[PDB]
Design a protein around this ligand. Structure first.
Ligand code: CDL
Ligand code: UQ
Ligand code: PLX
Ligand code: PLX
Ligand code: PEE
Ligand code: PEE
Ligand code: PEE
Ligand code: PEE
Lengths: 175, 114, 347, 70, 105, 98, 115, 113, 318, 83
């Protein structure tokens, strides 16, 4: 109930997801994914995850820049489609919006199990921590533990990245 | 699953230490040097019992020790302590490094008087 | 492709599978799957042509969707129980999603459509790898989480896989698609017995892998990808066609050949529980795979098809590259039934 | 000039002086004149909340000294 | 299927991150450290089949700590009854609840 | 579960449905894959922050890494497809049948 | 709260500037005035036609190298651990891996633009 | 050529030495501040325990007043089988208070910039 | 009281941008043996006001082929982001105090490129498209190296908080410790702001007006203001990062004067560089960033991880 | 030993940037294993008291544990002040 900020941000997250999942044109799909990344960063920030939200926003900004370049190169047409320029795209968009609104009404006015379990609402503030200690950020400590506890993870991740470079070069070699 | 036992409100009353964070920080080192025994007893109770309801008397003793410490500080070095904690309080991060003269005066007073 | 790069990619595929097999953490299992897929994509595209590119694209789309569902199931399981260890899978919705993702990775029906297409679009070596090594990781995970499986869903998918493999294989003249449909049916057999005994799953997997390796190696030795090109092999090397005929008979499950051993064992295991109708249906359905194996044997070994004049020139030259493991693979594919009790060593 | 470029530079300098000075003065005006408290960690936030609770007027910057302990 | 290479060699490749009750940096505890510790100690060595029955109480407490379903149900019941009482006008709510409380440090 | 958890799960389901229902462009489906990865990142981060699982805080970053790999892989394939046909339509990937 | 207010203020100021720009002056729009600009001559094709990217491989490599930034950002906090030898070994391992990937792409003509 | 490289290297070395001295001093200052926090911690813990217990007791009395109308409600009944102390969920401490206090208790630290 | 702070931040920044236009024109003139604006207003002091009044009383154009929504959205995004990038700067106190201010600047800077991208695409003209693709190439050129340089420099700060940089450089400027990183960072900020010799998105000689060729009047003025605000902001970030002014807690005005003077010096250096050099080819910028800056930056990142551990000089605030 | 000298000269004459990068990277790799102050950094990291030191219960058989913070027993930071 308290300012509904998390609920509003998650609803905008779902709206951006519906925006790019109706697939109007990769330009507008990239715009919707950027909007979703921003609101997801906000959602994670509201839970105390500053570093993770900022990181995911930066990564998806770079990814969508590359996707924009590739859309200009290889995924264009004479008339790019928007959400109101085509009946299939508009129908999918409106169906997604109505599905989100119906699910919200179902879970808010009632307390029923959609798929997994039930939910009454009350705002996400209830399940917080009231933990009072620390001269450090716990998320920062957990993420920094990658270089002392996660040696195996670092090894596999670095090997995967090097292999990915080799792999993309092999795939695009052609001939 | 059974009911939860809670202390009465009257059991939770104790004389309060009502000095701000700058005042507490300005006297933190001497406070930890003087009131060490009750504080350590309370912390051992807290970490062994794992229940705040079983270490109330130790908390009251900690408050009493802090009150006695601050009463002595008021009795002997009111003014140097006031200057030192005002200096500490002006800072936005409440830094020790920016006020060493006032700390030196307060240290000299407490060393000579007590 | 550079031989060094090819060796590195093959080693990365195997390392991803091994990471899946040795991990205790769900994140490390997912990472093993990701690494395996990343290294596997270029191996499918080694001989570059539009068909190979199409096969690689279809394979990537299928496996990426499967991995997304896998990660979502893991995260749901973590939400309902803060556990990362691969165990009895405390949530049923997560378990359903996990089962569907693993079935999509394996190519079980009804997520079976990509297997014939990818197999037909790639070379015979890539097909050998795809149909032998790529089954190990999902089957290992399924064996580890078998106690929490829902038998209805897995048995439905296994029966569908057997039926669809037989029916689809009945219609093929291309050898790679025949092998793919055979693989679908054998995966159905492997997953039918998984909720009851994982040792039987391992035994069926080993025998199937041996027979498939012998089949693919014989097909590489005689450069045939169609029925009509395989019908020429008798006029160049009859020994290869005779060994192929015996191997096909073994893959058909006829006693006293080795391919009879898994089905037999599986049937027995299913009758140790109640489970009477399903094994009968499975055997009667495997008769279809036997039928199209027999048709291949008719085309290649039991009758002689007309040949061409230029074949005379091929008589003057010998096979340069030799497969060192082909004879042992053929022997293990055919004459292994009398050593059946050694399956005790699998558990 | 070359010294006739200076007036525009002075105007830019005067414009750029405003943000920092305004922020400092506004911080001092709304925090008792003593350099608004910084809370990068939950411990400092707890300190501020305790100060606000014991201030008696719901303002953390109102500091209670030794005169508040009888 | 599972080749326990870590157990055979004593390597600890990934076991450090499997559970929340296992040696966090700076000794930061999980929100449900005690519940998970109790469930793990209950279920250790007896197998999954027996643990699913004989450690059901500890697991239920752990899940309640994780998701807090019953706590929200109880809070919602209390709030609903209080709202009905005030709407009827018989509630007569206290000053501390309304923000007029005498705060303590 | 709170409403936010249901919203994130719904976002994942929407992205999965968008991926499973192709229109014409392969790029749009790749975008749906990236959206699924983002939803998984958000959901895992929220769970890990809520339960104060300190060592699990590095897990979402790892996810992102492989997401990038998967994103790169897809793009590479798209390039080849375009070079074959002058377009990225999934209709052209029909040389192989069942 | 303050950051949301700042974002709202900045966006509102920009939107008001656009509104003033579009509603204050006199508008005389006709077909020739709003036609696309191509230096006085009509364009041959459309601007929505495919535009070749000569540096696509570098773009994919940029996607891959961007995640190593996320991997290496927590290093200031990682430098505060008790076991500094393992942390330094792993950080140098990651940086050496990134340098090796750059060297591999460099030597195989991967940084050269397509012609 | 040589002179410029030498001058740059000397500048780098002088900066390195100065930064080493300053960083060691800053480490000592951080240790001193951390020790002050350690000295102050037990009193904060005692007051936090008293605050939590007082809020819980007030909630218990208010719930005992509110929920006496219903037939089958045990007042103060726990939701856990175990009888050991469980840290409050903070929806239990601030559940009957105004939304301003709820906002300050939930998002107060995160939104303070 | 906070809204007053926001206004007292954002209005003076706009005035500073307006008069930076005049200062750049006059500096270029006097380096080109001419005077520059000295007619309208004494010493051209009324020239920015006249330019703004002319631009906002001029008809704005909506191209027939353009996508109108993105066309209008792009300048709003540009100006709002440029104004927002100023809020975490400590001068010596920030408007918004963030634990990770540096990462916030990084994220908002990498978001700012979509203004150029979307304006160029939504213009639906060939020159605008070429400019937008050049922007894509420029970002791909500079982003990774910029991030690694930032991390390498901040390895001596101990955190990502911008205020700590003041205490880190209490005795010596950070440039005396990382002058190679300072040089590479300066070139990278020249590239990040689309400034000469890296002004390729506009490309006046090659692309007429490039990405903003279809924009006129107020929407064009907004892009101009965003660009110059980014200039001043990036130079202020450089001044804070590498030339740390001494802060007296009882006299912040001295720090403010010092920091503003350093920022003005760096901005004048930007104008000097524009007046001094020719323009790069946009593949040559990529080659410079990926073949010269990146290997040296990786080596220096290794060195700046190893050095504090080697010398027992690790900063505080884990 | 003679051909590599010519190789180094040619690299310095054609690609000085790569020469400097490799030299800096090699120094950064090998120097930390030869420095005596790395262990000083480890000790400084270990001497930072992030958490509260929980006291031990006296069983009467721990002469190495101080009974008070100012007692002569316990660890010393006197090495840190001279650094
Ligand atoms: C339910 C919720 C639905 C949400 C709706 C989104 C809001 C936009 C709706 C109004 C735009 C449509 C008007 C129009 O097209 O021309 C009108 C009118 C008609 O012109 P015309 O020449 O006769 O014919 C034009 C053609 O018919 C065709 O004209 P066209 O080619 O321009 O049509 C394309 C247009 C038409 O719209 C549609 O096709 C359908 C509308 C649905 C779009 C929603 C898709 C989901 C995208 C992600 C989620 C976005 C947030 C949603 C949540 C909202 C609640 C908070 O679609 C868009 O361009 C979408 C732009 C809006 C997204 C804003 C994102 C800002 C990016 C900043 C970066 C993000 C940072 C990280 C966070 O022309 C005008 O009056 C001038 C243009 C008006 C522009 C004003 C400002 C831009 C739009 C407002 C954005 C507000 C954001 C806050
Ligand atoms: C080598 O030749 C060239 C030059 O040299 C002669 C140039 O100058 C030059 C740059 C163009 C100039 C003519 C400068 C033009 C000046 C701007 C376009 C006007 C910007 C001024 C306003 C829009 C700023 C806002 C106005 C307000 C007064 C700010 C305060 C805001 C309120 C709300 C308060 C170019 C491109 C060039 O090529
Ligand atoms: C039999 C065949 C052998 C060769 C094939 C091996 C294939 C795997 C590749 C590498 C082997 C993995 C073994 C290393 C596992 C890491 C964990 C172990 O080594 O302990 C670490 C020891 O760290 C050491 O530094 C070893 C790690 C250094 C690894 C060097 C890189 C080698 C990888 C090269 C191959 C990988 C792919 C190719 C990339 C180039 C951490 O110890 P410590 O920190 O005290 O205590 C942690 C517990 N705390 C947190 C409570 C304090
Ligand atoms: C720096 C940023 C912040 C600045 C703060 C101030 C913000 C200013 C607001 C932004 C707009 C600036 C433009 C001002 C010019 C007026 C534009 C418009 O509002 O006027 C007319 C709007 O009027 C409409 O055309 C119809 C008339 C009113 C419609 C009736 C609606 C019902 C309202 C009830 C009215 C009864 C009396 C109201 C007083 C109580 C439009 O006419 P039009 O020619 O096309 O557009 C060009 C205007 N020209 C002629 C100057 C070039
Ligand atoms: C006192 C002695 C100093 C000793 C210093 C250490 C050894 C120094 C020499 C080692 C190698 C020096 C550079 C390599 C030899 C010369 C360069 C060369 O091979 O050819 C140049 C050629 C580039 O020119 P082109 O782009 O092809 O030009 C096209 C237009 N004509 O180089 C290449 O082809 C490949 C370059 C690979 C670069 C390596 C990638 C980055 C790695 C450095 C980052 C940090 C490394 C630190 C880790 C290593 C630690 C030992
Ligand atoms: C003064 C009278 C007010 C009238 C309001 C009308 C609004 C409108 O849409 O009209 C379209 C109007 C004028 O069109 P014409 O009909 O051709 O000119 C009329 C003059 N004869 O077009 C415009 O100017 C567009 C106005 C801008 C929209 C403002 C709000 C948009 C919000 C943008 C949100 C996105 C921000 C992105 C950055 C945020 C990221 C952190
Ligand atoms: C767009 C992306 C917005 C990013 C904003 C980042 C702000 C930031 O980093 O500051 C974090 C700041 C302070 O936290 P710490 O620095 O860790 O220290 C606090 C302890 N003393 O945290 C907060 O205040 C978070 C509160 C607000 C959350 C941000 C909400 C912004 C959401 C943007 C959505 C845009 C509107 C939706 C429509 C899309 C566009 C049409
Ligand atoms: C004791 C242990 C210490 C460890 C060693 C540390 C010392 C290392 C010494 C070397 C550091 C040098 C850093 C320089 C980084 C890049 C230098 C470079 O080589 O770049 C050039 C080019 O770089 C440039 O010239 C930049 C182009 C853009 C110019 C824009 C204007 C010029 C700058 C004006 C002054 C800027 C002042 C910088 C700092 C400002 C204050 C912050 C590469 O291009 P080419 O010469 O064509 O060769 C490549 C093909 N073989």
């Amino acid at each position: 109930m308290t300012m509904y900020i998390a609920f509003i941000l998650s609803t905008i997250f779902v709206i951006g997801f519906v925006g790019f999942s109706s697939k109007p044109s990769p330009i507008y799909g990239g715009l919707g994914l950027i909007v979703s990344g921003g609101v997801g960063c906000g959602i994670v920030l509201n839970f105390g995850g500053s570093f993770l939200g900022l990181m995911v926003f930066l990564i998806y900004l770079g990814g969508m820049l590359v996707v924009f370049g590739y859309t200009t190169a290889m995924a264009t047409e004479m008339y790019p489609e928007v959400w109101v320029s085509n009946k299939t795209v508009f129908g999918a968009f409106v169906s997604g919006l109505m599905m989100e609104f119906c699910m919200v009404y179902y879970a808010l006015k009632e307390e029923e199990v959609e798929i997994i379990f039930k939910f009454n609402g009350l705002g996400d503030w209830v399940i917080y921590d009231t933990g009072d200690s620390g001269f450090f950020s716990e998320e920062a400590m957990g993420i920094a533990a990658l270089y002392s506890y996660g040696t195996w993870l670092v090894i596999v991740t670095g090997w995967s990245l090097l292999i990915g470079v080799v792999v993309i070069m092999e795939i695009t070699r052609g001939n | 699953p059974g009911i939860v036992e809670l202390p009465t409100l009257e059991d939770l009353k104790v004389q309060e230490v009502k000095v701000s964070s700058s005042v507490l920080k300005a006297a933190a080192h001497h406070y930890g040097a003087q009131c060490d025994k009750p504080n350590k007893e309370f912390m051992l109770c807290r970490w062994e019992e794992k229940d705040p309801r079983r270490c109330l008397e130790e908390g009251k003793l900690v408050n009493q020790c802090a009150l006695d410490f601050f009463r002595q500080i008021k009795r002997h070095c009111a003014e140097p302590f006031t200057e030192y904690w005002t200096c500490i309080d002006y800072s936005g991060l409440q830094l020790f490094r920016h006020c060493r003269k006032q700390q030196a005066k307060f240290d000299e007073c407490v060393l000579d008087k007590l | 492709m550079n031989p060094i790069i090819y060796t590195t990619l093959i080693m990365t595929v195997m390392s991803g599978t091994m990471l899946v097999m040795i991990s205790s953490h769900w994140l490390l299992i997912w990472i093993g799957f990701e690494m395996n897929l990343l290294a596997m994509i270029p191996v499918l595209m080694k001989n570059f042509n539009p068909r190979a590119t199409e096969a690689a694209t279809k394979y990537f789309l299928t496996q990426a969707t499967a991995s997304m569902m896998l990660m979502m199931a893991i995260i749901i399981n973590l939400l309902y129980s803060g556990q990362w260890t691969i165990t009895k899978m405390f949530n049923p919705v997560a378990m359903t999603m996990m089962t569907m993702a693993l079935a999509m990775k394996l190519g079980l029906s009804p997520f079976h459509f990509w297997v014939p297409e990818v197999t037909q679009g790639i070379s015979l070596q890539a097909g050998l790898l795809l149909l032998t090594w790529q089954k190990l990781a999902p089957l290992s995970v399924l064996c580890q989480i078998s106690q929490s499986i829902n038998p209805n869903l897995m048995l439905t998918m296994a029966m569908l896989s057997i039926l669809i493999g037989g029916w689809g294989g009945l219609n093929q003249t291309q050898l790679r698609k025949i092998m793919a449909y055979s693989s679908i049916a054998h995966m159905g057999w492997m997953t039918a017995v998984l909720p009851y005994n994982t040792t039987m799953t391992i035994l069926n997997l080993l025998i199937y892998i041996t027979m498939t390796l012998a089949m693919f190696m014989l097909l590489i030795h005689s450069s045939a990808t169609t029925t009509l090109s395989l019908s020429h092999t008798w006029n160049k090397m009859p020994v290869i066609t005779s060994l192929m005929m015996v191997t096909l008979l073994s893959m058909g499950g006829l006693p006293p050949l080795s391919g009879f051993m898994p089905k037999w064992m599986i049937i027995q295991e299913m009758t140790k529980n109640e489970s009477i109708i399903m094994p009968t249906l499975m055997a009667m359905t495997a008769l279809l795979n036997l039928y199209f194996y027999m048709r291949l044997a008719y085309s290649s070994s039991l009758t002689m098809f007309p040949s061409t004049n230029n074949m005379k020139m091929k008589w003057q030259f010998e096979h340069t590259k030799q497969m060192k493991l082909l004879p042992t693979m053929i022997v293990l594919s055919t004459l292994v039934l009398p050593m059946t009790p050694a399956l005790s060593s699998l558990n | 000039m070359w010294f006739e470029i200076l007036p525009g530079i002075a105007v830019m300098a005067a414009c750029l002086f405003i943000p920092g000075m305004a922020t400092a003065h506004i911080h001092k005006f709304t925090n008792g004149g003593k350099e608004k408290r910084v809370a990068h960690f939950s411990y400092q936030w707890n300190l501020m909340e305790r100060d606000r609770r014991i201030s008696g007027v719901n303002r953390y910057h109102v500091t209670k000294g030794l005169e508040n302990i009888d | 299927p599972f080749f326990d290479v870590q157990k055979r060699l004593g390597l600890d490749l990934d076991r450090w991150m499997t559970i929340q009750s296992a040696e966090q940096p700076h000794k930061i505890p999980g929100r449900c450290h005690a519940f998970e510790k109790e469930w793990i100690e209950c279920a250790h060595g007896i197998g999954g089949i027996r643990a699913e029955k004989e450690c059901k109480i500890e697991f239920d407490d752990f899940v309640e700590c994780l998701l807090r379903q019953k706590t929200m149900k109880r809070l919602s019941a209390i709030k609903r009854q209080r709202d009905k009482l005030i709407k009827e006008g018989k509630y007569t709510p206290p000053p501390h609840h309304l923000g007029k409380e005498d705060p303590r440090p | 579960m709170p409403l936010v958890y249901m919203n994130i799960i719904m976002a994942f389901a929407i992205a999965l449905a968008g991926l499973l229902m192709y229109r014409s462009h392969l790029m749009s489906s790749l975008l749906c894959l990236e959206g699924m990865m983002l939803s998984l990142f958000i959901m895992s981060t929220l769970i890990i922050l809520n339960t104060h699982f300190t060592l699990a805080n590095m897990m979402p970053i790892i996810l992102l890494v492989f997401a990038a790999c998967e994103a790169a892989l897809g793009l590479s394939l798209l390039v080849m497809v375009s070079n074959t046909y002058g377009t990225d339509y999934v209709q052209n990937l029909n040389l192989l049948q069942c | 709260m303050n950051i949301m207010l700042t974002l709202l203020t900045n966006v509102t100021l920009a939107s008001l500037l656009v509104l003033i720009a579009f509603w204050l002056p006199q508008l005389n729009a006709y077909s020739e005035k709003t036609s696309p600009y191509e230096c006085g001559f009509d364009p041959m094709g459309s601007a929505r036609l495919p535009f070749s990217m000569k540096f696509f491989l570098v773009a994919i490599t940029f996607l891959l190298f961007d995640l190593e930034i996320a991997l290496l950002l927590p290093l200031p906090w990682a430098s505060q651990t008790n076991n500094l030898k393992t942390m330094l070994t792993m950080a140098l391992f990651l940086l050496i891996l990134l340098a090796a990937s750059l060297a591999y792409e460099w030597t195989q003509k991967g940084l050269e633009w397509a012609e | 050529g040589y002179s410029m490289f030498a001058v740059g290297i000397g500048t780098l070395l002088f900066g390195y030495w100065s930064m080493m001295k300053w960083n060691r001093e800053r480490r000592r200052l951080q240790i001193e501040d951390f020790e002050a926090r350690i000295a102050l911690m037990p009193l904060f813990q005692a007051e936090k325990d008293r605050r939590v217990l007082q809020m819980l007791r007030e909630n218990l009395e208010e719930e005992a007043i509110i929920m006496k109308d219903v037939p089958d409600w045990k007042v103060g009944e726990s939701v856990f089988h175990t009888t050991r102390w469980v840290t409050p969920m903070m929806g239990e401490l601030y559940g009957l208070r105004t939304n301003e206090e709820i906002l300050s208790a939930t998002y107060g630290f995160i939104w303070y910039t | 009281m906070f809204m007053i702070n926001i206004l007292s931040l954002i209005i003076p920044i706009l005035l500073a941008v307006a008069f930076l236009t005049l200062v750049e024109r006059k500096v270029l003139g006097y380096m080109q043996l001419r005077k520059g604006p000295n007619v309208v207003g004494p010493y051209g002091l009324l020239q920015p006001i006249a330019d703004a009044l002319k631009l906002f009383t001029k008809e704005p154009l909506r191209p027939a082929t353009s996508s109108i929504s993105m066309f209008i959205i792009a300048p709003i995004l540009a100006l709002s982001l440029a104004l927002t990038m100023w809020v975490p700067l400590p001068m010596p106190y920030p408007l918004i105090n963030m634990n990770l201010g540096v990462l916030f600047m990084l994220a908002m800077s990498s978001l700012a490129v979509y203004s150029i991208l979307w304006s160029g695409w939504a213009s639906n003209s060939k020159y605008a498209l070429i400019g937008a693709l050049r922007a894509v190439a420029q970002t791909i050129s500079y982003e990774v190296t910029l991030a690694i340089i930032l991390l390498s420099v901040l390895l001596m700060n101990g955190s990502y908080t911008l205020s700590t940089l003041i205490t880190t450089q209490e005795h010596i400027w950070m440039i005396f410790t990382s002058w190679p990183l300072a040089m590479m960072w300066f070139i990278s900020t020249l590239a990040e702001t689309n400034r000469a010799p890296f002004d390729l998105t506009e490309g006046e000689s090659e692309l007429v007006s490039g990405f903003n060729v279809e924009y006129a009047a107020g929407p064009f003025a907004m892009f101009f203001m965003a660009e110059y605000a980014n200039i001043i902001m990036m130079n202020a970030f450089t001044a804070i990062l590498f030339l740390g002014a001494s802060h007296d807690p009882h006299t912040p005005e001295l720090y403010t004067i010092n920091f503003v003077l350093k920022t003005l010096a760096l901005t004048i250096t930007f104008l000097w560089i524009r007046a001094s050099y020719p323009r790069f080819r946009y593949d040559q910028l990529m080659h410079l960033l990926w073949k010269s800056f990146l290997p040296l930056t990786l080596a220096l990142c290794m060195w700046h991880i190893s050095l504090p551990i080697m010398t027992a000089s690790i900063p505080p605030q884990s | 030993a003679g051909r590599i000298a010519s190789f180094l000269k040619n690299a310095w004459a054609k690609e000085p940037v790569l020469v400097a990068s490799f030299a800096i990277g090699g120094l950064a790799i090998i120097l930390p294993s030869l420095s005596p102050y790395t262990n000083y950094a480890i000790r400084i990291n270990r001497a930072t008291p992030y958490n509260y030191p929980v006291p031990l219960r006296d069983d009467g058989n721990m002469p190495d544990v101080p009974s008070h913070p100012q007692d002569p027993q316990g660890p010393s930071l006197e090495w840190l002040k001279n650094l």
